[PDB]
Design a binder for these strands. Sequence first.
RNA 1: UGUACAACGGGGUAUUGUAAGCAGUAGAGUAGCCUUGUUGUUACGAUCUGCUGAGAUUAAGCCUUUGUUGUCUGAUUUG
RNA 2: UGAUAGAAUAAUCUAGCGAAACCA
Lengths: 324, 129, 122, 70, 225
Amino acid sequence: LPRKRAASIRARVKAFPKDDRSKPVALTSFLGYKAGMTTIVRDLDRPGSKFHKREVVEAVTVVDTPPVVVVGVVGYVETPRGLRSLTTVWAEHLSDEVKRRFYKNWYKSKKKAFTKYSAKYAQDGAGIERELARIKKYASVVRVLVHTQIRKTPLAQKKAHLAEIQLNGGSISEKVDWAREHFEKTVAVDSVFEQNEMIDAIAVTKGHRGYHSRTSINHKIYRVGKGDDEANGATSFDRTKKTITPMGGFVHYGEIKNDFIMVKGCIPGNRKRIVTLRKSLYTNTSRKALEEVSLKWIDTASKFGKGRFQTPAEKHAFMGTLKK
Amino acid sequence: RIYQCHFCSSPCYPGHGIMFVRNDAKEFRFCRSKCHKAFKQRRNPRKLKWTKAFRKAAGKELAVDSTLTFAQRRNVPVRYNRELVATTLKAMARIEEIRQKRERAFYKNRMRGNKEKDFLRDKKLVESN
Amino acid sequence: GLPVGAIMNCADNSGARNLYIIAVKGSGSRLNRLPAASLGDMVMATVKKGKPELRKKVMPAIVVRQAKSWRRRDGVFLYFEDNAGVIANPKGEMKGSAITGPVGKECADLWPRVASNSGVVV
Amino acid sequence: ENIRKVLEKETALRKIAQKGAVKLFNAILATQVKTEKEVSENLSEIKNKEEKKELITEVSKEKFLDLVKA
Amino acid sequence: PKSMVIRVGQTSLANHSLNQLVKDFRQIMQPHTAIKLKERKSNKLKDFVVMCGPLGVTHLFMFTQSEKTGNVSLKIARTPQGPTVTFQVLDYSLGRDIKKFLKRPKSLNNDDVLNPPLLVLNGFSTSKRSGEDDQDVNVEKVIVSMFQNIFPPLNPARTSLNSIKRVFMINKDRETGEISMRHYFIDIREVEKAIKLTELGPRLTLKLVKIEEGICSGKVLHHEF
RNA sequence: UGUACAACGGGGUAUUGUAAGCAGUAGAGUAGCCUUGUUGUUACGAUCUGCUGAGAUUAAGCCUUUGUUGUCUGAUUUG
RNA sequence: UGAUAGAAUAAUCUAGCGAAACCA
Ligand SMILES: [Zn+2]
């Protein structure tokens, strides 16, 4: 392949997994921001391997997961020339993150982005509800418009990212009504992704050669960590009350007070990068897919140097008191 | 399983530190390559002031406590009792609290005597003139 | 940790002093690289000093001590005090009755007879 | 005690920095305003070829600068 | 009329205190001499600035401390072939210490004061003889030319008097043998005048040492000891 | 004109390994002084001990900031 | 009186001057 640079730093999802209309209406991908890498102790459950029922130490990558919010939908009708959106539907109240995304000079603009669109709910909704019933009627496939809570993130960019997600639940009408309830509300990955899920990662890699869109597939999610948990770094074996945040935090990133996904292996791109987490394009059954992993211990030490503790309470407990 | 550093006494973890094994099958774990290269040069941790051979040999901290009677490697295993588990958890948390309290109060003995010797030494800078 | 042309110790009681590896069995084929032996590897090795009956003849030998820090599956980086191997048949059945010094855990897991003649594991 | 007597000399040189700054400020003001007035009155009006004008301006500016200096 | 600032020597780049002086001199000078994004200087390059610098810069500044004696030195240079002037420091002052000694609302931070500073010579020279040595008078006149020619030339009726913000003064008493460089940010009292001053950055004092060639240690032109 | 930005400051994390300076009976010994010693003590004494994981660095591409302080603007283009 | 200047340190650019070969 000719190595030309990426178009956008938010990499495109060129293909989505297959629509099952017998499952409830649910998302198919997510956009998070990778914090960094650490090392996880767990037990291997692999008969046929000599390392069966044996402690393995594994490199993982953790992506910060702010809860994503839906602000619009887009229905595509089939043409003999390809997919084409007949329209897009927006919600009324959109944040300055998203109105910032449309603008290049937000700091001096009069911020006039979706003003007259807000007059479209000043009415009963007749044009808007006509459009919703149109996307019920036409537009065989449905994509939803989502953006992240980037202010809840140590990113210096206050401008959140918008993306489309193909909605592979059932019933296009129930899909657009589902999105209609889910306008301006939130969706966490706990209703979308789960433990042991084989996911694919779509991300622009590290420029220096580089800065190319890459899709690395078949990565087992190891932890769907909740933001309210203070035992994010804990296990049933590791009974410390500690977070997933490293000692000193993630290097050049900040922290994760939000939800997070800890996934096996490595991933294209660097830290501070927008990464799409897509579920698998097929039902992998490789027994590397079916594995219900069970963690044991989480490294949360410093990568800012050769770390030697996990909690600072452990640090004071070993070092005792100081002169300071 | 947590082991100590051979050179720091610091807790060694998976992925952390290098082990050396002599011909007499004695494993020595080091939390970092500073400890490991310090062992390579045949050095004494009683010479290096920061490591706990010097600090437990020196008297900066207390080194024997009645709280230390609980932490010991036991070669005879015990059958599983679920009801002892949470009691051991409460024991570990409580005893670590008591250990930090005794260590800080042991350091509280150190700072009072400098008042007395500063009194006795500033009397010498007054009473001669 | 040992490429082609490496002197290693002799931990069995056969009578050889040192084992000079001249070939590594089961190594890859890449240009300008060297076939590198490690723990749990049967390589062709020649005896330099000891009994002359074991000298001037290559023997297969399994390496029990490596002295280069490897990554074990559980999280530890570890290495022996020296390089050492024990000579045996290609069938893996030992020549020496008792193998002195520490024997690697992966190597004793690999060969049942080496573990049958292992005194010290790790 | 002594450091305040040092601060006396430091505020003294501060006011020394103040005086010449106010002087050169009012000097550049006076020279620019006077030369703009004198060129706007007669000097720009007559020949207007601007080969001659610029020399007259620089002469008037150097003259008023020499007057406000010494 | 661009300018450089560098600390020369292992002892200089070893000192974190002298880095503060480097930062503050970078904050004092004009936008044309704003060397900014040259904070990270290298261990490898030693008088390597003279090869790439005179493509686009003049008037280099050197910091150096002797390995034997505990004194640090300024040198003032030209990147074309000229003179250098060697100085010992006196009473190095941290600008953060001038913060804590006296709190003043400073405009070093904002980009509104992205403007060149000005020239005040507090009796640095005497055109009169005043003594038996006229070479000292020549020293005074040459260094006057130095400070009026490091900064951009200001034919004053051409100069726009809107930008005043940075001002700079060199205090030379003849009896002390001491030259002191103290600069202030200006404030305007609009009375048709009256002008306030506030301290901004580092306050110093220097001592004349020697005059060499503009390439350092090339030709020692004048001794003064 | 704002959870706004920035210079400081603070806290966190990591690096190096006990800073300067104070005290000593610790110091192989040499003279010195008598109260010729059952450690009598006073001077020099590389070093050692306590103050002291002390002191130094810490983002220049680490993290955080209810603390301080200042800031917010011009040039061009389109129906 | 003699020599393309200017800048790059007194080791590439601008400026100035400015060909010929050949040409169903
Ligand atoms: Zn250690």
